[PDB]
Structure 1
Amino acid sequence: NLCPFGEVFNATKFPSVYAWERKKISNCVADYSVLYNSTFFSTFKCYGVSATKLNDLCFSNVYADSFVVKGDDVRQIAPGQTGVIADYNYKLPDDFMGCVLAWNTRNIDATSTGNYNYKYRYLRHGKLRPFERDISNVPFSPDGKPCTPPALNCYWPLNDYGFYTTTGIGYQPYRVVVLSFELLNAPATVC
Structure 2
Amino acid sequence: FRVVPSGDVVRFPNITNLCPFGEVFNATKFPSVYAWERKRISNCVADYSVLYNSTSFSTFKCYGVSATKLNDLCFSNVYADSFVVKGDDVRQIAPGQTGVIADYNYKLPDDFMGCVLAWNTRNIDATSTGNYNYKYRYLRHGKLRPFERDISNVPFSPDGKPCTPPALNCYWPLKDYGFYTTSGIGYQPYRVVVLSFELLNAPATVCGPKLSTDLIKNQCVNFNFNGLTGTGVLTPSSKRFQPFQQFGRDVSDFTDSVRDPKTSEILDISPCSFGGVSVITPGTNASSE
- Place the TM-score, normalised by the shorter chain, in its bin: over 0.9
The alpha carbon displacement at 1:163 in A equals: 0.8
Q: Which moved more, 1:29-38 or 1:152-161?
A: 29-38
Once the 2 structures are TM-superposed, how far is the Cα of residue 67 of structure 1 from its aligned partner?
0.3
Aligned to 1:7, the other structure's residue is in SS state: helix
CA distance in 2, matches of 1:37, 1:60: 28
Task: Report the counterpart of residue 120 of structure 1 in structure 2.
Answer: 136
| Residues in 2 aligned to 1:21 and 1:90: alpha-carbon distance in whole angstroms | 11
What is the rounded CA distance, in whole Å, between the counterparts of 1:97 and 1:186 in structure 2?
A: 15
- How many residues were matched structurally? 190
Contact conserved, 1:61 with 1:181, CA < 8 A, in 2? yes
TM-score, reference length from structure 2:
0.62
Do the aligned partners of 1:71 and 1:173 also contact (CA within 8 Å) in 2? Answer: yes
3-state secondary structure, aligned to 2:70: coil
Shift in Å at residue 180 of structure 1?
Answer: 0.9
SS in 2 for 1:159: strand
Cα deviation, residue 183, structure 1: 3.0
* Matched-pair identity in %: 98
Whole-angstrom distance in 1 between the partners of 2:21 and 2:73: 17
CA distance in 2, matches of 1:36, 1:75: 24
SS in 2 for 1:53: helix
Q: Which has the larger radius of gyration?
A: 2
TM-aligned CA distance change 1:183 to 1:37, over 3 Å: farther
1:12/1:37 CA distance change after superposition, 3 Å: closer
Give distance in 1, aligned partners of 2:160 and 2:20. 48
Does the residue aligned with 1:34 lie in a helix, a strand or coil?
helix
Contact 1:146 1:154 in 2 (8 A): no
CA contact (8 A) 2:131 2:178 kept: yes
Give yes or no for contact 2:19–2:47 (8 Å, CA) kept in 1: no
1:49-104, Cα deviation, whole Å (9 max, x unpaired): 22100011101121101000011100000111121101110111120131111110
**Contact 1:24/1:63 (CA < 8 Å) preserved in 2?**
yes
Q: Quote the offset at 1:40 in angstroms.
A: 0.5
Q: Following the alignment from structure 1 to structure 2, what is the Cα–Cα distance between the partners of residues 165 and 100?
A: 26
SS of alignment partner, residue 102 of structure 1: strand
3-state SS, counterpart of residue 54 of structure 1:
helix
Q: Report deviation, 1:2.
A: 3.1
Counterpart secondary structure, 2:123: helix
Distance 1:19 1:124, change over 3 A: same
Question: Structure 2 regions of 5+ residues with no counterpart?
Answer: 1-16, 207-289
Q: Which has the higher contact order (CA 8 A, sep 6+)?
A: 1
Structure having the higher strand fraction is 2
Which TM-score applies when normalising by structure 1? Answer: 0.92
